[PDB]
From Swiss-Prot:
Residues 349-388 are annotated as: Interaction with NPM1. Homodimer. Interacts with IRS1. Interacts with RAF1. Interacts with RHOA (activated by GTP), RHOB and RHOC. Interacts with PPP1R12A. Interacts with EP300. Interacts with CHORDC1. Interacts with BRCA2. Interacts with NPM1; this interaction enhances ROCK2 activity. Interacts with SORL1. Interacts with PJVK. It comes from Homo sapiens (Human). Residues 68-330 form the Protein kinase domain. This is Rho-associated protein kinase 2. Residues 333-388 form the AGC-kinase C-terminal domain. The modification Phosphothreonine is found at T385. The active site is at D190 (proton acceptor). It is found in: Cytoplasm; Cell membrane; Nucleus; Cytoplasm, Cytoskeleton, Microtubule organizing center, Centrosome. The chain holds residues 25 to 417 of 1388 of the full protein. Expressed in the brain (at protein level). An interaction between Thr-385 and Asp-24 is essential for kinase activity and dimerization.
Length: 388
């Protein structure tokens, strides 16, 4: 019998108790105890007298924000920003996402990133944006990701009248990407053009994974919270808010339908002035869906959309991705499914240099209160740090 299994767990970079997680655990403990009020406790003061000095030192050898140059800001979420950065020593360009620890604690939403980190770190797929380094300081999480200089599809669709030839391509790439995520045992749950980014050669990678979830042995989730963003959410996910909902990956294919509809027609199928408007339409989709007379659309395209926008029970892709691939809409002369991502994309970005952010739009003070007793504001972020 053996400490052989023990050693194994510590070296595995997927493990929750690898060396970097353990150092996060020691660092976070020191950050949460080192306040005048708490040091009135002998145990706490004595502990910190031993480790405070060495923990400062460790933190100095650690990757920091100051190791990067901020070239410019290219996106702002609810929890922080996305920066185009150049790492100083290597001189290489990355996209760095910052998540404010303050805003995540405050909004009670401080565990969404574990799946996103895992997927980007280890997917090793051309369809998934790659994470190179994850690190933290007392105020932020940082994810250093490969930069996608073609911008998102929400930007492509707003600069072009998209013909069907193009939609075949982009839809197919979304289909393969999602199938990749599903084969890693995960349902995306937030498929939309904002999370679809175009690489240098004009091909697509999925970029955000903050709503992902692991499936059961069977292929399902049990989830009682509706998630994703209103316009693209499926009826079964929305229904599951009320309690004991029980869905599989077919919820993502709904979102493909919404995406394909938007790309050809120019507006989302269930668009409405209000949130509760859009939700009321999605629920009543059998009656609310219809294409305007004038926006002219192929009968195969229209069919594919309707094959996606139906009840889970008969939705295209309930039997697996195979029936999606053979749908007549995808027939064309440029690409088959094994080679699509090495053919010429419909829009190749024009870039001047390795810091060209021209496909992103331009963009234009908050601390934890000092504690009394022990709040543990850093505990949710132990295990985040990762080096490639």
């Amino acid at each position: 019998s053996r400490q052989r299994k023990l050693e194994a767990l510590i070296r595995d970079p997927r493990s929750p108790i690898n060396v970097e997680s353990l150092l996060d655990g020691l660092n976070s403990l020191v950050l949460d105890l080192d306040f005048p009020a708490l040091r009135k406790n002998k145990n706490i003061d004595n502990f910190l007298n031993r480790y405070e000095k060495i923990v400062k030192k460790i933190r100095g050898l650690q990757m920091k924000a100051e190791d990067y140059d901020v070239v410019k800001v290219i996106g702002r979420g609810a929890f922080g920003e996305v920066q185009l950065v150049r790492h100083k020593a290597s001189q290489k360009v990355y996209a760095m996402k910052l998540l404010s620890k303050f805003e995540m604690i405050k909004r009670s939403d401080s565990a969404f990133f574990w799946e996103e980190r895992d997927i980007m770190a280890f997917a090793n797929s051309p369809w998934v944006v790659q994470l190179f380094y994850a690190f933290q300081d007392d105020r932020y999480l940082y994810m250093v990701m490969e930069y996608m200089p073609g911008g998102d599809l929400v930007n492509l669709m707003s600069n072009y009248d998209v013909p069907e030839k193009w939609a075949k391509f982009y839809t197919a790439e979304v289909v393969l990407a999602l199938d990749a995520i599903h084969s890693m045992g995960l349902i995306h749950r937030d498929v939309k053009p904002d999370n679809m980014l175009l690489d240098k050669h004009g091909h697509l990678k999925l970029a955000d994974f903050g709503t992902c979830m692991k499936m059961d042995e069977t292929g399902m989730v049990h989830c009682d919270t509706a998630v994703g963003t209103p316009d693209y959410i499926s009826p079964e996910v929305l229904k599951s808010q009320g309690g004991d909902g029980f869905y599989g990956r077919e919820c993502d294919w709904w979102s493909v339908g919404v995406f394909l509809y938007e790309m050809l027609v120019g507006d989302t199928p269930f668009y409405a002035d209000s949130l509760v408007g859009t939700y009321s339409k999605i629920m009543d989709h059998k009656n609310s869906l219809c294409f305007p007379e004038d926006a002219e659309i192929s009968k195969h395209a229209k069919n594919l959309i309707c094959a996606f926008l139906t009840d889970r029970e008969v939705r295209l892709g309930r039997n697996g991705v195979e029936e999606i691939r053979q749908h007549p809409f995808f027939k064309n002369d440029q690409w088959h499914w094994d080679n699509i991502r090495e053919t010429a994309a419909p829009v190749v970005p024009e870039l001047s240099s390795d810091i060209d952010s021209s496909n992103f739009d331009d963009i234009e003070v908050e601390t934890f209160p000092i504690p009394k007793a022990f709040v543990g504001n850093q505990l949710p972020f132990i295990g985040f740090t990762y080096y490639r």
